[model samples]
Target: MADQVQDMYYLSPMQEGMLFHAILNPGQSFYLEQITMKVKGSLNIKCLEESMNVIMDRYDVFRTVFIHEKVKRPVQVVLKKRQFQIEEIDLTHLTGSEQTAKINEYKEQDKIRGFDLTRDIPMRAAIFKKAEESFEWVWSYHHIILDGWCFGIVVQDLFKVYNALREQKPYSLPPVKPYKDYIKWLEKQDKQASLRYWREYLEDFEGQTTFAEQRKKQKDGYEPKELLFSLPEAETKAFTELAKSQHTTLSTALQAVWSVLISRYQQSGDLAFGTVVSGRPAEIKGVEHMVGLFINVVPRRVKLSEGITFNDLLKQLQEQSLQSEPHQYVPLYDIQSQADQPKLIDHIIVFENYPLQDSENGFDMVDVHVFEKSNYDLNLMASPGDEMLIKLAYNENVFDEAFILRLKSQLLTAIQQLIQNPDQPVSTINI
Candidate 1:
């Protein structure tokens, strides 16, 4: 692909944060985003490649790179055209059992293959073909270029275009608003207002809220350690239903429970922790339809006190969450700088509200999963469903699996008790 430069623009607030993180820790792969899909059907190789090209042609963010040397500050450069070739690995010769092992091995290595954000397309794709009819495709990219919402758009658009191209039909997708337009929206934001709100919202917040009972030993590298746990189907149903009966979403109830747990374990009255928010402002038309990194992680501070009932805590958290709508886009670092204390939060509580769909890219694809990585000391994700999955990902260098599970056990028990007795004192809930 020839380098036909379109133009350069200032990075969005979220993008700026990503670039800084990647630059500061060159060895970390926390910023890499990998979405893996297993498809079973007759494949169209040419059309698939062209579909990726079409996606790049449509969204400049896919072809973007960080340029820090020439500009006053780092800016994103979008190239008019960039190449994305699907590297195919044909394992049709191997039996199903053998193929599974090879795929696992390949997946780990693929993840270890880190990215250089300063150059290249910032995105990639590879297809592992087990047979003519069965194959798995992995699309990897830097998180700086896309978010959960954008990937939904990617699936729909790519499928729509691929089907049209294969059927030899003309298909024109709705023209997308440029990523630069979103940056335009960011420029018009009231920074002072956001600063004032956060300063007031998190005022007097104490030191970093962490899970480790004692000081953690330092490590040199940033490879993340992950452990998966799931709630019993009965417990999951009861908790979700109880949340509805309480007039709150599952995320709010869970966040409320988690924040209270942090206060209990960390031995503090109140503390700050991070939560992921989709920063797509509703006021901006077609912002949802546009693709790019539009996710921001802001600190959610919860101050526990006596006489706070479970019902009251949920209401307070839900109402506070509603108020945080306007300031969701504020950078975590910016929020941190305004804090009087140092490293106000070391853990991130992520409620997994976004998951890959059953099928959109085509060919009877199901059970879509994204292999995620994080730099935070402790990252907890509670996936939403009738049979909910509660996962904790941490840096092994900081804490072991046993430590995470100890906290996990406490959380599971607490969630059960909290939901069952919504009238119980928040202080009384425990594992």
Candidate 2:
């Protein structure tokens, strides 16, 4: 597969949603989050290149490009044969700590380098080799091409083909679905129903959410701040149980507590904010395994009732959430059209359940990890595992970094308070 056209199709609803956002916010780097694979074995660059090409050939989304001028609504065309190469760097001259610091610098620079949606391939890679055997495998791609679940599939398939090629052993993968199938699936959705639901869902938007309008003159720009922290496993376990008692998941539990925080700060009974979901169309076969943009951010409305039991609030959330699933794939742009509200939802909570499991894929990728950098005013990220890991990425231009950092404390306190007094009035739940 040298250079071929494997498929062509309209963007899925989620893809359209992302492309629409990127068109106006081209300079914002919210979707440029990179996933790094740390390897410890002596790996050959040539072999890595061969494996990457094979994987790219198998999944056309890696080579996807948006054809802007060709259609009424721009469509993403997948090229059949695309070349992928790893950019390798040697960091052996510095101490271990120094090399880590340098890697952080390089990661930031690489992310800001950005991508050309109309011309460039959707993914890039780099390798920083310490000793001949010690290496850090860093690869990044745009969110338009893939989501977190796709990463799991890519790692499994890439490493499978990689180890097979390096060892000269047989390798095989199950049948796959073309990304075009997703576009077809989207055409069959009940879009009108979605808009109607959203209009009613956000019946009364309190004019965009604001934490007290600032009176200061605008400066040039401000840097965003990010802080990552973890909760004790006991808290995680207790919260999981609370979610079960409420007929919900730990994700819903977290959202409920966070909503309380916002309500406390803004002093409102009704509030709406963005929450991201895996927009995979479960009705389609093998949809979960297919690669491409499958994450959608939709407004989640929370209504607080005074003296209501915590369990009752959870039940309300659970019912509303399930009822809204049929319309979850509705694009934010479309919903924005139906509602007469301003940008009432700015903050977003991303529950990334996609497992970045250790590379048992024939590579010693020890201390394997992933993270994201975002431009949202407040973006809360969590991967609900044995012990939930949470991070807050906040824009410092409009808010105090110290205040943003302190929310970590408030979050824990709220979680504990909810668990201990499940029947306390919402008025008294404020920390």
Candidate 3:
């Protein structure tokens, strides 16, 4: 197996963080990512399988594994050749409801199966036949290899090959820019300057903001749950207009509102929460299209005062974001080390601005379900648009679904009030 290795390189900072969590909680599935899609159409099974194999060959991430036991530090080892075949399961004999139950059971068991980083490849796929033309496709992978942004690139390339194969036509894609290029880029950064930058940014910070309530006091494990809700189109429009009037982006406004609510929840005037930044450096020519992990999480500290207006807070947050733009590459672990308090944040917010591609083939992607877990107790994934979609992935042991529903309502109300009344003091606004 060692002789079959093609190359080896250091893991990215985000990959290191994820690997740390995975190793710490071996059975918790901390960074395991799974996507199950319900496809309805006459699918070309041979072409689809061949397309997946082509994807594995085109991207080094698919053929990688982690080695840590004997090595000084963990590094990703890319194999010379990795074979990928989508497993097919026949469940057409069961009734519709029974098929649904069986599919759910298979998903649960597959997730619990998890991956062995030492030897197993990072990704796997399977298909459950529901009917003659309907099938459920499940793809499971370890998050160390790819980030959310890489989904479009991978899918586009996969389908480009799939379509060509199905039509019996030749196809080609640009050569893969090796992920090692990114690892080398990370090695050239100024470490000391980053330390000083985070040190100054978190100068007087102390305690982190907590969720305040835990559904079960004895809960010690990480059991993730997702609650999704959408903002009304009018509310989304109001916030967009407000951002325009204030000359700031909607993301900054959301951060400010979240900071204020977290401050109120913890009864503190100052607090911090984590925000994920697209760590893809523009200096690299093809960084945007590179398929690898290039996201970093850094703490955004906000201070609220009774006399300050919401617009001012928005401006302040925008300025802070600009000041830290260059230093966004600093690892969360390193930033936490510089801060006065350990565990700088318990919750994180991710603004999903990545592009998504639609299926032009006869097969339509009708439904999608993703399962991902992080170390944080709560995660806010915001997709801003005509209707802002917000999904909260939290530890079910720490928070109740009903409580999250109430919190969701409060978040919507606060956003509307703050955006509509930009000049009003935060203390005067009703949450």
Candidate 4:
């Protein structure tokens, strides 16, 4: 196995942070992520299976694994070549209800049996046959290998290769931008400058904020759950307009509103919460097309005043975000270490704008579902579109159903109030 290694390189800061958590909680699915999409109509299973290997050969991410046993620092090793088998499960014999129950069971078990980062390549795929030409395709893997945006790219490539092979047509992809380039870029970054920026940014930060009023640590492991809902199209449009009028983006508006609510809930003027940024550097050629974990979670601190207007807060938040854009490549752990308080925040606000085509390459891909877990207590994912879709992945033990429901109502009311009057004082905004 050692001789089979083609190349080895350092892990990115964000990847190192994720690896730390995985090591801290052994046998637990800390960064395990799975995506299941429903497919209908005639499908060639053999071609789809062949496409997996083609993609694995094309992208170094598929052949990568973590190694940190006796080494001074962890390194991601790329194997020369690795073969993947797309498992086929037949559920066509079962009744409709039985098939549904079995599918749910399979999903649960698949997640529980998470990947071993040291040995496994961090990706697997399976297709469950429900009926003639009807199937559910499940792609399970560790988040360390790729982010949400990469999923769409891989799917597109998969079908392209599948179609070309099935039709016996010539097909080829452009030159691959290896993940090693990003690692090399990280090597050249000015760490001291980034540290200075972070230290100044988090200066005078005393403590963190949390939504857990009477939170208790999980005894065994986390029972992850998510509540997904969408705002009305008209309301979403109005909110977007409000953000535009304030000369900020919907993402900034979301962070602003979330910070306000957290401040109110904790009854504190100084607040901090995690906000995810696409950590891909523009300097890297074709970074967007690269398949890797390029997202970073940084602490967003908001100091609210009693008399400040919501519009002003939005502007301030946007400014802060822009200022932090260059330094986002720094790891969350490094930033926290620079601050006086180590644990700065528990929840995170993510604005996902990954554009994916629903139906493409002669395949109707629908009912796309993602299952993932993290150390954070709460995760608020806002997918912006004609109608803003909000999904809250929270710990049930920490927050009850009623509490989450009330939070949903309050969040909706907060947006409505902002749309009504952005000039209202921070204290006047109802949450």
lDDT of the candidates, in the order given: 0.80, 0.77, 0.82, 0.83
* 98-196 per-residue lDDT for model 1 (tens digits): 988887776777677657777868888778898877888877878888887787788688878899987888989888899898888888889899888
In TM-score terms, candidate 3 sits at: 0.87
TM of each candidate vs. truth:
0.84, 0.86, 0.87, 0.88
Candidate 4 residue lDDT tens string, 26-66: 65667888778798877777788899899999889889989
Q: Could you tell me the TM-score of candidate 2?
A: 0.86
Candidate 4, residue 138: Cα displacement in angstroms equals 2.1
**Which pairs of residues clash in candidate 1, taking residues 3 or more apart in a chain or in different chains?**
none
Give the residue spans of candidate 1 off by over 4 A: 1-7, 24-27, 36-40, 89-119, 134-136, 164-172, 214-225, 242-247, 353-372
Model 3 C-alpha RMSD vs. true structure (Å) is 3.1
Return the number of clashes found in candidate 1: 0
Give residue 292's error in model 4 in angstroms. Answer: 0.9
Query: Model 1 misses residue 63 by how many Å?
Result: 3.5
After best superposition, candidate 4 residue 129: deviation in angstroms?
A: 1.9
C-alpha lDDT (0 to 100) for residue 360 of candidate 3: 55
- TM-score winner between 2 and 3, please give it: 3
